Design a protein around this motif. Structure first.
Motif, PDB file in Angstrom:
ATOM      1  N   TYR A  32      -1.657   5.419   6.899  1.00 13.25           N
ATOM      2  CA  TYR A  32      -2.556   6.034   5.552  1.00 13.25           C
ATOM      3  C   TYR A  32      -1.109   6.720   5.017  1.00 13.25           C
ATOM      4  O   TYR A  32      -0.638   6.884   5.770  1.00 13.25           O
ATOM      5  N   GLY A  33      -1.403   6.366   3.628  1.00 15.00           N
ATOM      6  CA  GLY A  33       0.351   6.677   3.145  1.00 15.00           C
ATOM      7  C   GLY A  33      -0.493   7.699   2.585  1.00 15.00           C
ATOM      8  O   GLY A  33       0.161   8.626   2.518  1.00 15.00           O
ATOM      9  N   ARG A  34      -1.034   7.588   0.570  1.00 15.35           N
ATOM     10  CA  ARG A  34      -1.343   8.982   0.153  1.00 15.35           C
ATOM     11  C   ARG A  34      -2.308  10.006   0.456  1.00 15.35           C
ATOM     12  O   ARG A  34      -1.958  10.799   0.274  1.00 15.35           O
ATOM     13  N   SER A  64      -2.708  -1.711   6.305  1.00 14.52           N
ATOM     14  CA  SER A  64      -1.696  -0.668   5.413  1.00 14.52           C
ATOM     15  C   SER A  64      -2.543  -1.072   3.950  1.00 14.52           C
ATOM     16  O   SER A  64      -2.781  -2.155   3.285  1.00 14.52           O
ATOM     17  N   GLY A  65      -3.188  -0.141   3.460  1.00 15.97           N
ATOM     18  CA  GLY A  65      -2.880  -0.245   1.554  1.00 15.97           C
ATOM     19  C   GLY A  65      -4.702   0.582   1.091  1.00 15.97           C
ATOM     20  O   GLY A  65      -5.352  -0.624   1.243  1.00 15.97           O
ATOM     21  N   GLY A  66      -4.586   1.283   1.044  1.00 17.11           N
ATOM     22  CA  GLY A  66      -6.494   1.443   0.130  1.00 17.11           C
ATOM     23  C   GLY A  66      -6.908   1.915   0.722  1.00 17.11           C
ATOM     24  O   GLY A  66      -8.179   1.733   1.134  1.00 17.11           O
ATOM     25  N   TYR A  67      -6.679   2.099   2.552  1.00 16.69           N
ATOM     26  CA  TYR A  67      -7.813   2.301   3.276  1.00 16.69           C
ATOM     27  C   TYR A  67      -8.069   3.979   2.833  1.00 16.69           C
ATOM     28  O   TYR A  67      -6.836   4.632   2.467  1.00 16.69           O
ATOM     29  N   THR A  68      -9.501   3.843   3.340  1.00 12.77           N
ATOM     30  CA  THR A  68      -9.589   5.657   3.250  1.00 12.77           C
ATOM     31  C   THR A  68     -10.278   5.302   4.562  1.00 12.77           C
ATOM     32  O   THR A  68     -10.232   5.037   5.800  1.00 12.77           O
ATOM     33  N   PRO A  82       5.023   4.129   6.548  1.00 10.92           N
ATOM     34  CA  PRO A  82       6.377   4.444   5.938  1.00 10.92           C
ATOM     35  C   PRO A  82       6.018   4.795   4.708  1.00 10.92           C
ATOM     36  O   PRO A  82       5.849   3.944   3.706  1.00 10.92           O
ATOM     37  N   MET A  83       6.931   6.435   3.936  1.00 11.64           N
ATOM     38  CA  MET A  83       7.067   5.976   2.911  1.00 11.64           C
ATOM     39  C   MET A  83       7.971   7.257   2.249  1.00 11.64           C
ATOM     40  O   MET A  83       8.477   7.623   2.371  1.00 11.64           O
ATOM     41  N   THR A  84       8.963   6.446   1.873  1.00  8.71           N
ATOM     42  CA  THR A  84       9.912   7.500   0.744  1.00  8.71           C
ATOM     43  C   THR A  84       9.554   8.358  -0.450  1.00  8.71           C
ATOM     44  O   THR A  84       8.497   8.296  -1.089  1.00  8.71           O
ATOM     45  N   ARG A  85      10.365   9.209  -0.270  1.00 11.44           N
ATOM     46  CA  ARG A  85      10.254  10.637  -0.446  1.00 11.44           C
ATOM     47  C   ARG A  85      11.311  11.235  -1.068  1.00 11.44           C
ATOM     48  O   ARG A  85      11.370  12.552  -2.014  1.00 11.44           O
ATOM     49  N   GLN A 144      -0.423   2.080  -4.335  1.00 17.48           N
ATOM     50  CA  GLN A 144       0.112   1.880  -2.707  1.00 17.48           C
ATOM     51  C   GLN A 144       1.249   0.865  -2.876  1.00 17.48           C
ATOM     52  O   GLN A 144       2.035   1.200  -1.683  1.00 17.48           O
ATOM     53  N   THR A 145       2.231   0.932  -3.196  1.00 21.28           N
ATOM     54  CA  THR A 145       3.317   0.254  -3.724  1.00 21.28           C
ATOM     55  C   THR A 145       4.284   1.406  -4.121  1.00 21.28           C
ATOM     56  O   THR A 145       4.156   2.678  -4.599  1.00 21.28           O
ATOM     57  N   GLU A 146       6.639   1.000  -3.454  1.00 22.11           N
ATOM     58  CA  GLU A 146       6.903   1.833  -3.715  1.00 22.11           C
ATOM     59  C   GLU A 146       7.175   1.834  -5.048  1.00 22.11           C
ATOM     60  O   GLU A 146       7.641   3.546  -5.620  1.00 22.11           O
ATOM     61  N   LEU A 201      13.696  -0.370   8.832  1.00 21.45           N
ATOM     62  CA  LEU A 201      15.130  -0.329   8.701  1.00 21.45           C
ATOM     63  C   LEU A 201      14.843  -1.102   7.040  1.00 21.45           C
ATOM     64  O   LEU A 201      14.192  -2.336   7.044  1.00 21.45           O
ATOM     65  N   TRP A 202      15.662  -0.197   5.902  1.00 24.46           N
ATOM     66  CA  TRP A 202      14.937  -0.950   4.597  1.00 24.46           C
ATOM     67  C   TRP A 202      16.479  -1.532   3.772  1.00 24.46           C
ATOM     68  O   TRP A 202      17.094  -0.215   3.374  1.00 24.46           O
ATOM     69  N   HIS A 203      16.565  -2.782   3.343  1.00 24.95           N
ATOM     70  CA  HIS A 203      17.376  -3.201   2.719  1.00 24.95           C
ATOM     71  C   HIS A 203      16.098  -3.904   1.390  1.00 24.95           C
ATOM     72  O   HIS A 203      15.852  -4.538   1.791  1.00 24.95           O
ATOM     73  N   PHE A 223       5.682  13.110  -6.104  1.00 28.36           N
ATOM     74  CA  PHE A 223       6.142  11.751  -5.202  1.00 28.36           C
ATOM     75  C   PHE A 223       7.586  11.523  -4.382  1.00 28.36           C
ATOM     76  O   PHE A 223       8.178  11.561  -3.286  1.00 28.36           O
ATOM     77  N   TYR A 224       8.544  11.468  -5.388  1.00 23.97           N
ATOM     78  CA  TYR A 224       9.986  11.305  -5.242  1.00 23.97           C
ATOM     79  C   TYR A 224      10.892  11.747  -5.828  1.00 23.97           C
ATOM     80  O   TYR A 224      12.208  11.960  -5.954  1.00 23.97           O
ATOM     81  N   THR A 225      10.475  13.215  -5.650  1.00 25.72           N
ATOM     82  CA  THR A 225      10.774  14.246  -6.339  1.00 25.72           C
ATOM     83  C   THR A 225      12.072  15.107  -5.030  1.00 25.72           C
ATOM     84  O   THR A 225      12.550  14.630  -4.770  1.00 25.72           O
TER      85      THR A 225
HETATM   86  C1  LIG Z   1       5.102   7.093  -2.358  1.00 23.93           C
HETATM   87  C2  LIG Z   1       4.842   6.149  -1.727  1.00 23.93           C
HETATM   88  C3  LIG Z   1       6.298   5.762  -1.215  1.00 23.93           C
HETATM   89  C4  LIG Z   1       5.994   4.224  -0.242  1.00 23.93           C
HETATM   90  N1  LIG Z   1       7.649   3.939   0.844  1.00 23.93           N
HETATM   91  C5  LIG Z   1       6.851   3.552   1.550  1.00 23.93           C
HETATM   92  C6  LIG Z   1       8.532   3.013   1.754  1.00 23.93           C
HETATM   93  O1  LIG Z   1       9.159   2.932   1.990  1.00 23.93           O
HETATM   94  N2  LIG Z   1       8.158   1.533   2.794  1.00 23.93           N
HETATM   95  C7  LIG Z   1       7.512   0.671   3.042  1.00 23.93           C
HETATM   96  O2  LIG Z   1       7.225  -0.452   4.128  1.00 23.93           O
HETATM   97  N3  LIG Z   1       6.575   1.007   2.429  1.00 23.93           N
HETATM   98  C8  LIG Z   1       6.059   2.010   1.527  1.00 23.93           C
HETATM   99  N4  LIG Z   1       5.426   2.506   0.733  1.00 23.93           N
HETATM  100  C9  LIG Z   1       3.865   1.532   1.108  1.00 23.93           C
HETATM  101  C10 LIG Z   1       2.446   2.965   2.142  1.00 23.93           C
HETATM  102  O3  LIG Z   1       3.736   2.206   4.024  1.00 23.93           O
HETATM  103  C11 LIG Z   1       1.732   2.608   2.529  1.00 23.93           C
HETATM  104  O4  LIG Z   1       1.590   0.954   2.683  1.00 23.93           O
HETATM  105  C12 LIG Z   1       0.510   2.747   1.218  1.00 23.93           C
HETATM  106  O5  LIG Z   1       0.910   3.628   0.909  1.00 23.93           O
HETATM  107  C13 LIG Z   1      -0.711   2.145   2.276  1.00 23.93           C
HETATM  108  O6  LIG Z   1      -1.229   2.644   0.910  1.00 23.93           O
HETATM  109  P1  LIG Z   1      -2.448   3.927   1.083  1.00 23.93           P
HETATM  110  O7  LIG Z   1      -1.492   5.012  -0.396  1.00 23.93           O
HETATM  111  O8  LIG Z   1      -3.763   3.777  -0.325  1.00 23.93           O
HETATM  112  O9  LIG Z   1      -3.158   4.777   2.207  1.00 23.93           O
HETATM  113  C14 LIG Z   1       5.085   3.768  -0.326  1.00 23.93           C
HETATM  114  C15 LIG Z   1       3.974   3.969  -0.523  1.00 23.93           C
HETATM  115  C16 LIG Z   1       3.892   5.121  -1.627  1.00 23.93           C
HETATM  116  C17 LIG Z   1       2.594   5.794  -1.951  1.00 23.93           C
END
Ligand SMILES: Cc1cc2nc3c(=O)[nH]c(=O)nc-3n(C[C@H](O)[C@H](O)[C@H](O)COP(=O)(O)O)c2cc1C
Ligand SMILES: Cc1cc2nc3c(=O)[nH]c(=O)nc-3n(C[C@H](O)[C@H](O)[C@H](O)COP(=O)(O)O)c2cc1C
Lengths: 376, 376
Positions: free
Chosen positions: B332-334, B310-314, B22-25, A280-282, B98-100, B360-362
């Motif tokens: 929710y992320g993944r 956030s993180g690991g929620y279903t 937020p998810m980096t892709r 779940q992290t980057e 906003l991300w550094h 995820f990152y292609t």
């Molecule tokens: C592919 C991917 C990219 C992510 N990119 C970011 C990001 O750019 N900034 C951020 O704060 N968290 C990022 N995260 C963490 C997610 O925002 C989120 O906290 C996490 O996916 C939630 O857990 P889950 O996937 O089980 O729902 C990313 C997670 C994944 C899997």
């Protein structure tokens, strides 16, 4: 499948390389091995397979978990004999792990509520918890630092327990010198603040494990002694400033015991740190295990004998370890809890049952212990 | 279903509690937002649903992934506006994160060949790797501990990017202060080894995030600012000697900005630790799940405003979080990667598509990005 090529561990012709790692399960009510342990180990035994028991008490002061078996009384020996007999009837080889927790204990586990013993007076910090007899988590207390004479008495507790294991029919014993327990409290410079001949230098910090291993080697023979260490695992505040240097120093000493004794130990068994790749992290899944792998391979290369690796192994990682020459045997813990037939499942590349951490340390003789299903 | 009870976030009348994390892709080719992002976010947008964008660059030196968007050029602002418009046409609310990345960078992402900036000179350790432009994994370099005087210029980069996000039409921004990136490199005493005013005390370590948040609040208003932190995470060597004191110190300064501003922030966004370390040890997991729930509940009780977890929620854990009062909103992320209509699927308790980490990152604008199927 390299996990199923035979391996010769001393006199023992093992048919495969999947080992039952030692695991505390707390079903040995009031420290007496119970019939439930016989069923549990019998489920997991295979012809030509090697099993290592749960950590087993060497004395009344050695426990820091509830209902862990001892092997320091004759009553315990007699109950262990029944378990050893059912494992041997399946053609397995079984070693008893001798475990003293040192400062990782609590007044509730000590005779007359005495303080736990250690190399040091420093307690484990509140980063860590102890499992209490009522299933709650407690706080580790301040230990008492033992002197030279008492160290020699603890060594004799190891020797007497090793003799008792042989009396019970065990094929050998494993010295638990890992995971921040008593021996690791002498080895790690993050715990051992002694200024006497057991503290300071690498030589001094290695004295206690050398004396323990030498005493049991002189009692039952090097071939019936395995040694387990974890220089790179900092469980229970057990850090070393230089884990690879510490690991090599221990290996040094084991090689020297072997030369002087004229015989090899059964094995060196090392558990490695294993970092879970958070999904779940980057970047959690971009990680590399190369440095820890190189540490493990350097310990294996340095040690003159059989090497058992452990810590987060899967079917795929176990195959790789043996195929690459990184280990002779691979021990499995959590997957063996939930897969009584883990050996066969790995052979067949069958699905593996999930394990339930909630029943790792409960007392029921069946639930979460012997009721994980076989392949159907 | 508590996840579909409406929620008032500031002036935003949300119709349900399911948030796009937020998810980096890495589809924002050459750091310019692309039409593919529009389709991707439009697919996931719902009436009254809250979306947070992928982490977005605040300067040319702020990235640690390939083809991540920026919002520091006017070209970037123009392309973002097109994405914001299609999301708004669907009735959704959208914030730009906003991300550094700080020390989590590489020379390939450093246009002037400069070392990545950080609180510290220590590099990320060997067990973490960076994603390279060609898909391979690279090694993190040694960063440069920025001088006291350079901090204000990075704060200024956040402020200008927040203004640009507002110019693009975003409803707000989120400060990425989590997961071992630049702000978290100042927060965590496992990273921040400074001895100046930004190091040492919890107060000193919290100064950087406080100044970032204050600058953006003074630029665009508190109502348009959300803040993301992760006081307890295993990511890029970001550890702290007391996560709770650290998290509460951050919350108390956020509460104070709200008091002096006369307006509440949009929200606080906290990553769930999901602690799984030391699973292979005897005691490593004892009392850790309890500590984790204590941490999250203590922070939400202390923070005076909207709380997103956030993180690991279903579906089930998200329901329980809102039911027990643990969070107002659940991101929710993944599962949102592979289920464009996750909201609808959660509402109906429909099957959820599996996700493919390999994409995820292609860079493909479709494959693994917008070609996951809706409910038929
Ligand atoms: C592919 C991917 C990219 C992510 N990119 C970011 C990001 O750019 N900034 C951020 O704060 N968290 C990022 N995260 C963490 C997610 O925002 C989120 O906290 C996490 O996916 C939630 O857990 P889950 O996937 O089980 O729902 C990313 C997670 C994944 C899997
Ligand atoms: C419930 C449990 C009990 C354990 N008890 C012991 C023990 O008594 N002695 C020991 O040396 N290691 C013990 N360990 C560590 C295991 O022997 C083994 O190193 C670890 O489980 C291997 O990692 P794996 O579970 O991923 O296979 C235990 C581990 C678990 C999970």
């Amino acid at each position: 499948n390299p996990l199923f090529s035979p391996y010769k561990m001393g006199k023992f012709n093992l048919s495969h390389r999947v080992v039952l790692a030692p695991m505390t399960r707390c079903r040995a009510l009031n420290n007496i091995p119970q019939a439930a342990l016989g069923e549990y180990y019998e489920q997991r035994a295979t012809a030509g397979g090697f099993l290592i028991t749960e950590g087993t008490m060497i004395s009344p002061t050695s426990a820091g978990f509830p209902h862990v078996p001892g092997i320091f009384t004759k009553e315990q020996v007699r109950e262990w004999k029944k378990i050893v007999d059912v494992v041997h009837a399946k053609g397995a080889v079984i070693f008893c792990q001798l475990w003293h927790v040192g400062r990782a204990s609590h007044e509730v586990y000590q005779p007359a509520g005495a303080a736990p013993i250690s190399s040091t007076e420093k307690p484990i910090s509140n980063r860590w918890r102890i499992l209490m007899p009522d299933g709650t988590h407690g706080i580790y207390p301040k230990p008492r630092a033992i002197g030279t004479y008492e160290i020699s008495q603890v060594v004799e507790d190891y020797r007497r327990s090793a003799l008792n294991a042989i009396e019970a029919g065990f094929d050998g014993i494993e010295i638990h010198g890992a995971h921040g327990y008593l021996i690791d409290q002498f080895l790690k410079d993050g715990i051992n603040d002694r200024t006497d001949e057991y503290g300071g230098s690498l030589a001094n910090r290695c004295k206690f494990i050398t004396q323990v291993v030498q005493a049991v080697v002189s009692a039952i023979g090097a071939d019936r002694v395995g040694v387990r260490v974890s220089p790179a695992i900092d469980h229970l505040d057990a850090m070393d400033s230089n884990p690879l240097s510490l690991g090599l120093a221990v290996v040094e000493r084991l090689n020297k015991i072997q030369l002087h004794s004229g015989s090899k130990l059964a094995y060196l068994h090392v558990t490695q740190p294993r970092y879970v790749a958070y999904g779940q992290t980057e970047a959690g899944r971009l990680g590399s295990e190369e440095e820890e792998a190189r540490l493990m391979r350097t310990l294996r290369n340095a040690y003159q004998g059989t090497f058992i690796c452990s810590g987060g192994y899967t079917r795929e990682l176990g195959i790789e370890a043996v195929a690459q020459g990184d280990a002779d045997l691979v021990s499995y813990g959590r997957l063996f809890i939930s897969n009584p037939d883990l050996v066969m499942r790995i052979k067949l590349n069958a699905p593996l049952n999930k394990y339930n951490r909630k029943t790792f340390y409960t007392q029921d003789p069946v639930v979460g212990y012997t009721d994980y299903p076989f392949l159907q």
